[PDB]
Amino acid sequence: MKLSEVRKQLEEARKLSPVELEKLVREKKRELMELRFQASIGQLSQNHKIRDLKRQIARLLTVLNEKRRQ
């Protein structure tokens, strides 16, 4: 993921609501599960996708937790 995309993801997430951030987090976690299945059967050549998605989920949880703390 490029540096510009990371800023976009953080900018969009901060405009959401805690209900929406949980739903987006769950969809991202589901996407990561499908990557693990692909990587298990040796069908994921672009293995960098797994790290990129994991850090995205961490970013959304960090933003979600900030909104919970006001």
Partner: peptide, 14 residues
């Protein structure tokens, strides 16, 4: 956040 997608890790290939 614990979800159903953190429970299932990978298929067993054998």
């Amino acid at each position: 956040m614990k979800t159903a997608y953190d429970v299932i890790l990978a298929p067993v290939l054998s």
